[PDB]
Design a protein around this nucleic acid. Sequence first.
RNA 1: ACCAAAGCUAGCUCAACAUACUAAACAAAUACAAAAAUACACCAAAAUAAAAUAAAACAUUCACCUAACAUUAAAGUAUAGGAGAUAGAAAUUUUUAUCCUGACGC
RNA 2: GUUUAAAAGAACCAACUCAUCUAUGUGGCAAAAUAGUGAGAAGACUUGUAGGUAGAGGUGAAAAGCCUAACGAGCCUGGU
RNA 3: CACGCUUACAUCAGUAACUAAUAAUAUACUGAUAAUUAACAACCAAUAAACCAAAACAACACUAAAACGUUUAUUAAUUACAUUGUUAACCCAACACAGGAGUGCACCAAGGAAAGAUUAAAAGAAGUAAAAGGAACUCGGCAAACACAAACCCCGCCUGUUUACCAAAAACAUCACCUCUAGCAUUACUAGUAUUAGAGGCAAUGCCUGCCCAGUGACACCAGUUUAACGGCCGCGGUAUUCUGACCGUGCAAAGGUAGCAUAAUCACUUGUUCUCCAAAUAAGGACUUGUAUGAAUGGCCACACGAGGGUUUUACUGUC
RNA 4: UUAAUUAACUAUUCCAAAAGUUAAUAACUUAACAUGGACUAGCAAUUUCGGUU
Lengths: 393, 122, 46, 159, 240
Amino acid sequence: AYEWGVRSTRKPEPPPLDRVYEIPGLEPITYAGKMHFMPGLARPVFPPWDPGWTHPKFRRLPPLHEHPLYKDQACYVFHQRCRLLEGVKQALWLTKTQLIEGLPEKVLRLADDPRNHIENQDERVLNAISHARLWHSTEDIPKRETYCPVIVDSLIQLCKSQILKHPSLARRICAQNNTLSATWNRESILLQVHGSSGARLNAKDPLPPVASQEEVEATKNHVLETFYPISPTMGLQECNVYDVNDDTGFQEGYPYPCPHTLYFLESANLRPRRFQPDQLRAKMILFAFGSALAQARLLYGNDSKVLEQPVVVQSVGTDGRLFQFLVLQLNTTDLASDEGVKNLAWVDSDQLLYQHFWCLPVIKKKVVVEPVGPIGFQPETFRKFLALYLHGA
Amino acid sequence: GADRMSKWTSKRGPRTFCKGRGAKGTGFHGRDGKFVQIKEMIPELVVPELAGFKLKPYVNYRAPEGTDTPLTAKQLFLETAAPAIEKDFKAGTFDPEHLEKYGFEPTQEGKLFQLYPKNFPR
Amino acid sequence: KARGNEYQPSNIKRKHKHGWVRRLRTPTGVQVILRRMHKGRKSLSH
Amino acid sequence: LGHRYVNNDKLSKRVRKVWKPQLFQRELYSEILDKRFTVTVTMRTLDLIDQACGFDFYILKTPKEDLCSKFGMDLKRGMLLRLARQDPQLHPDDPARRAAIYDRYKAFVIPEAEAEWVGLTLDEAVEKQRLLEEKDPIPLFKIFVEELLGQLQQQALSE
Amino acid sequence: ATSVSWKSRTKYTVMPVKMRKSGGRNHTGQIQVHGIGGGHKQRYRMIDFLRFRPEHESKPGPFEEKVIAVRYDPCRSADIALVAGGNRKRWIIATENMKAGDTVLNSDHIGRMAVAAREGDAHPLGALPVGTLINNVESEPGRGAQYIRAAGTCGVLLRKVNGTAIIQLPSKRQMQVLETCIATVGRVSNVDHNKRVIGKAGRNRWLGKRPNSGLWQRKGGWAGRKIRPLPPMKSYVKLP
RNA sequence: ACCAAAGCUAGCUCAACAUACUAAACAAAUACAAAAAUACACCAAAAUAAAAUAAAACAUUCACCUAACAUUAAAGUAUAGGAGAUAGAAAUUUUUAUCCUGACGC
RNA sequence: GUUUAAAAGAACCAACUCAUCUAUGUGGCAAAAUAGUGAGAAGACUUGUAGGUAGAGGUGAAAAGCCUAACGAGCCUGGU
RNA sequence: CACGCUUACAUCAGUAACUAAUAAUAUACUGAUAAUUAACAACCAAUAAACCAAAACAACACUAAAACGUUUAUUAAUUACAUUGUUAACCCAACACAGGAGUGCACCAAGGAAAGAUUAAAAGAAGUAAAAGGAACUCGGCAAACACAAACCCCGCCUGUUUACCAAAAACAUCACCUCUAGCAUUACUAGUAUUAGAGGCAAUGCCUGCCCAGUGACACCAGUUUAACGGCCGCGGUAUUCUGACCGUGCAAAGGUAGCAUAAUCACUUGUUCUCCAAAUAAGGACUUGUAUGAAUGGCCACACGAGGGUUUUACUGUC
RNA sequence: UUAAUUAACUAUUCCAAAAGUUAAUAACUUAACAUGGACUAGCAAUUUCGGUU
Ligand SMILES: [Mg+2]
Ligand SMILES: [Mg+2]
Ligand SMILES: [Mg+2]
Ligand SMILES: [Mg+2]
Ligand SMILES: [Mg+2]
Ligand SMILES: [Mg+2]
Ligand SMILES: [Mg+2]
Ligand SMILES: [Mg+2]
Ligand SMILES: [Mg+2]
Ligand SMILES: [Mg+2]
Ligand SMILES: [Mg+2]
Ligand SMILES: [Mg+2]
Ligand SMILES: [Mg+2]
Ligand SMILES: [Mg+2]
Ligand SMILES: [Mg+2]
Ligand SMILES: [Mg+2]
Ligand SMILES: [Mg+2]
Ligand SMILES: [Mg+2]
Ligand SMILES: [Mg+2]
Ligand SMILES: [Mg+2]
Ligand SMILES: [Mg+2]
Ligand SMILES: [Mg+2]
Ligand SMILES: [Mg+2]
Ligand SMILES: [Mg+2]
Ligand SMILES: [Mg+2]
Ligand SMILES: [Mg+2]
Ligand SMILES: [Mg+2]
Ligand SMILES: [Mg+2]
Ligand SMILES: [Mg+2]
Ligand SMILES: [Mg+2]
Ligand SMILES: [Mg+2]
Ligand SMILES: [Mg+2]
Ligand SMILES: [Mg+2]
Ligand SMILES: [Mg+2]
Ligand SMILES: [Mg+2]
Ligand SMILES: [Mg+2]
Ligand SMILES: [Mg+2]
Ligand SMILES: [Mg+2]
Ligand SMILES: [Mg+2]
Ligand SMILES: [Mg+2]
Ligand SMILES: [Mg+2]
Ligand SMILES: [Mg+2]
Ligand SMILES: [Mg+2]
Ligand SMILES: [Mg+2]
Ligand SMILES: [Mg+2]
Ligand SMILES: [Mg+2]
Ligand SMILES: [Mg+2]
Ligand SMILES: [Mg+2]
Ligand SMILES: [Mg+2]
Ligand SMILES: [Mg+2]
Ligand SMILES: [Mg+2]
Ligand SMILES: [Mg+2]
Ligand SMILES: [Mg+2]
Ligand SMILES: [Mg+2]
Ligand SMILES: [Mg+2]
Ligand SMILES: [Mg+2]
Ligand SMILES: [Mg+2]
Ligand SMILES: [Mg+2]
Ligand SMILES: [Mg+2]
Ligand SMILES: [Mg+2]
Ligand SMILES: [Mg+2]
Ligand SMILES: [Mg+2]
Ligand SMILES: [Mg+2]
Ligand SMILES: [Mg+2]
Ligand SMILES: [Mg+2]
Ligand SMILES: [Mg+2]
Ligand SMILES: [Mg+2]
Ligand SMILES: [Mg+2]
Ligand SMILES: [Mg+2]
Ligand SMILES: [Mg+2]
Ligand SMILES: [Mg+2]
Ligand SMILES: [Mg+2]
Ligand SMILES: [Mg+2]
């Protein structure tokens, strides 16, 4: 084949030993006694230096097998920045869930009900979009890394403004960068959703099951789509040092145990650094599944069994202008076999909050043709956002 | 052209040329880029108690001086170890193998302040 | 156009082209330093 | 390195010429040291070996001025030290073979006091002498204790 | 001063790596090739020319991969294609009609029956029909496709005798190799590459071609239409 | 009458002898971009002298030309040389220890 | 900035980069400048910093150009 | 602010003389004494894995394929205050030099002074205005102008590059078209593979590129092939009344200059002859044309657009006259 | 350069050296280097340009 190392760039081989080292029963006269190199004398060979006292910073990195958590079986870890090739398909296979396009009927009713709207919804959301895209920064054109989390927090506050009408949203709390770890063995493959998400809403009261028993039973007749050339573990980190322990983001006795909504942000100024929409949907599905598995194993136990009480989690992925909503109902825990009941997931994809935004007024032929502000606005996206927020109460 | 006779200090270079003026280092660089100062590297000034010390920076002008007798190794030995070794040899318990009782040190690496490596500044 | 200003000062280039390390890293620069020492120059390099 | 006349005529051009030997990578086996060295030798080297009827014979017979090789001098020094020490590491399982090998090279037996100084250059010899004479300075406490013991013994014997 | 090469990367990756161009300068610093330098900034997409390369040594049998995207490569005149099989992806040289969402086979099995040659498929020369168009052919089994790679170019299999295959290169020269040498079937992508028209002298500078020297040189005896016969067949089989 | 002019010293030069030959200073810092206390290496290399000139040109040649054998003769001899310009030995001979060192040198 | 479905080696014209023509200057402001006037001005564009190629050579969209104010081959030292 | 110079910066005091190309006095001379205080800037983690999907308001695209990043796993001394750059009127040009100098802000809210004092000679430089004429000046409409337009040729397709400091061009390069040289791997070419890469010629495009391997080269190691290889493509005499020669005789060649254009940027004769332009032309343009020394990729003929290239007209304009 | 003497280096080819192979003294091959002597070319080196008029 073609080796990828160039000889002139690789570590050069040590020079050949002096001819005095090949004579048996002869001591070499080197320059080791003068503590410096001197021509004409042999090159002294030194044993590997032993720092009898160890130093933390200036020691060689210990190998991977020396670690006490090292295991022989390879675990496929999915962290925050793991990309999937066949995103939705791989996620559905790894989580054993069935995909549905539209949002659940409960959240759809909660959205379409005009009584659940804010006072001035159109103007409020337009002002939030304008403040996020233009006003929040002193620069002319703010960057995505600044206007994505700002718009997410603005929508979160617009939803929080509904607590005076619904005195039940106070049962929630927010969390940032909490270590989640949910490992499961599926088809003789040890997968593990492990890492930290963007934002996590927790609540005191659980989310009621949204899938009907008819849908749960019809899920038995549904088969998962398979991809032959690609392995389901494509894009995951194959590691050997890991812990098979259901460690959620919090300890025991947490007053807000039930996860309500995960929030993922694609706040990167570069297209290659951002996530694709399909990969973002897969990431949010996998992390919602990890949260649901952690909650289920903390509630009922680590035994693999179909849950008589499903676990409903929500997730929102924001590119800055594109929103992806997910409602995942976990119903089973045994995932090695592909014959039993599967979970459900409703994924509303490609929800445009606004088409474009002009931070500066365009002028063509000495006349302004489009003023400053968002061009095109779909309030149904914020309606679904508010439905997902109020789904708990 | 530039000057060659003047000293090459840190004031005469670009921003990336920051040469010290001769002070000793007091730590290292931590994790977030800040400087972690080590309290063992900073010199601890050992100051005595000058309250009841009856000695002044100057001496009496009428006080007499002495002949210059620079203290030597032979004189120090005669003052600290010659009487002890002489008494030990007169008593007959002299041990040429063990000389640690008279003040001799076989290896300097044991004690704190060694003499040849000079672990102490002052 | 107008000449005479061919010298644009820069300490990095100065010390990298005529510095002590630059002189000592080559056997010819060592000979230069030895010649300057034999003549008795106050400044051997920049 | 020299000069030559093209067309072998004095009245013609003078041209610098470098005559080089034909080097060969050959493997030579030594009986005293018991090792096969992959050395760059010449046809004249092989001819001298065949004339001396042995690699070790050639090494032990041709002096430094005829070897002109630091590696050859090192080989000679090694085999001379082995012959002077009667090294059992030559053949620990064949004492008869070791003795038979040591007998046929009896004409070049040199004592140990001179067998470790033949294949050394001036720098190597100075380094060896420095390593031999490298002694730590004894503390003045020892000298003063010895002087005091001498004085005490003198005062004890003078009574 | 002596410069170091930018090709210090032992681990194969699919992501494009940055490369430092050098205009005709060797590692010393003097011009070795004239008319090179000052092009567009480019990245390097590492191509896997050993087509038949299984993921793990436990299953060395033939394998099928899926094409994800056919992309443009500034380093070569052909188009590259990302193919994924198992747990890894790799860049290969796309054939003429290779599109996104195709399946490519990579086999090393030779049988008494010839196989139906598709485009993305890669079988040894001993398993292909006698009149098959091929590309990315090999010299020795397992050496790698050094031969035909350019856009639109393709060789043709002529005959197979004594377990040795004879091919014909785009230079109309015959090349004899072992029949176990893997080769990709079909023509290389971008068949219209020769028909491209550099619109101006600036596109050559974009590509990284410095203008020719202005020195007028009188033609020597080398010039003129030299009608030379075809050179003998280049054989790579080692006959004991 | 201004401008100006004159000192006799600082010191140098050539030899003899000579211990036997990289002076004194080296507290700290000095081959990081020298004089910047402090981190897992890489270190080192050799391959003829050439030409200006003379041969009234210039092609073979051209004493000395940074390699010890000194002195008296052999001897500018034998020899080597576009046998031109020029180059040039040897065999064999002679050479008595120390002080008397300073200067028709500035 | 303006014209253009155009960032088109497009057009007008600033900053900027070159130097067409003329007049002063010619021991001058200047060992190559000033004033007016010109050419390009989204590109084969200008430009900052740092590095490389060294003279029997380097580099050159060949002017036998440039390589620290004198280059048909730099300068310094030595031969001298 | 960066780069660069290092105290030239600040306060007090003095200037007879030294520096300011002269004084007044002083940021530029002299002496003494003081000063630039970190939050800004410099020094300020490695080892493996997931990572193809540009920046241009980036919604999404084009080609020339494009710097700028997080997450996960293992180790990262752990304990206030570390070290260094902080002035200026300044740098490179022998100078307190009308020159050369990167970046972000604004066109003044900040910087400064063309005149040491008189008179109003010549000549010189810069500007403004000018009767009537309007290029009659001159090599040329150079310069200037209340003008700032329209055409015809030569040479280069065009943008571009060049003799820093007398030549910017018709020179070079150039897209395009042709030749040769190469079947291939760890430092150029190239991490490429004949639709590729080098050594060259000529110049976009359009119509074409005619004959010749005799000589010299190069492949062929001799024959033989090659001119989009170096280069060459004919004499003498008579002929259809009186002018030419379709034609013929004879001789040598490897072929004997084909198409095209032509008094040209093309030896001399040449200011060739003729028509247009002017009152007048060795100017310009169009024709005739052996140019016995044009000529076809050392390329030949036309054409758009272009050119501070070289010439010629028409008005307009004006002190060029 | 179609001047006179011809080096080094780079591409050819040949002989010798070195490695070897076949048969009862002969014939034959050279992967990377690589030494000595010749051959053909590139890149090139030294020197010169008689005098009267
Ligand atoms: Mg100086
Ligand atoms: Mg500095
Ligand atoms: Mg600075
Ligand atoms: Mg600190
Ligand atoms: Mg100068
Ligand atoms: Mg390329
Ligand atoms: Mg390409
Ligand atoms: Mg070309
Ligand atoms: Mg040319
Ligand atoms: Mg002469
Ligand atoms: Mg003379
Ligand atoms: Mg002469
Ligand atoms: Mg002469
Ligand atoms: Mg000489
Ligand atoms: Mg003779
Ligand atoms: Mg003569
Ligand atoms: Mg333009
Ligand atoms: Mg000007
Ligand atoms: Mg004017
Ligand atoms: Mg201007
Ligand atoms: Mg313009
Ligand atoms: Mg223009
Ligand atoms: Mg440099
Ligand atoms: Mg010469
Ligand atoms: Mg040259
Ligand atoms: Mg020329
Ligand atoms: Mg010329
Ligand atoms: Mg010069
Ligand atoms: Mg200065
Ligand atoms: Mg004055
Ligand atoms: Mg002052
Ligand atoms: Mg300041
Ligand atoms: Mg006046
Ligand atoms: Mg004034
Ligand atoms: Mg005045
Ligand atoms: Mg006047
Ligand atoms: Mg006037
Ligand atoms: Mg006027
Ligand atoms: Mg008038
Ligand atoms: Mg006139
Ligand atoms: Mg006139
Ligand atoms: Mg004009
Ligand atoms: Mg005009
Ligand atoms: Mg006009
Ligand atoms: Mg032009
Ligand atoms: Mg055009
Ligand atoms: Mg240029
Ligand atoms: Mg010029
Ligand atoms: Mg220029
Ligand atoms: Mg000019
Ligand atoms: Mg021009
Ligand atoms: Mg041209
Ligand atoms: Mg054509
Ligand atoms: Mg031409
Ligand atoms: Mg043409
Ligand atoms: Mg032709
Ligand atoms: Mg021929
Ligand atoms: Mg012929
Ligand atoms: Mg005509
Ligand atoms: Mg003529
Ligand atoms: Mg006229
Ligand atoms: Mg002609
Ligand atoms: Mg011609
Ligand atoms: Mg020709
Ligand atoms: Mg024109
Ligand atoms: Mg131009
Ligand atoms: Mg022009
Ligand atoms: Mg000749
Ligand atoms: Mg000579
Ligand atoms: Mg010459
Ligand atoms: Mg003559
Ligand atoms: Mg004459
Ligand atoms: Mg005459």
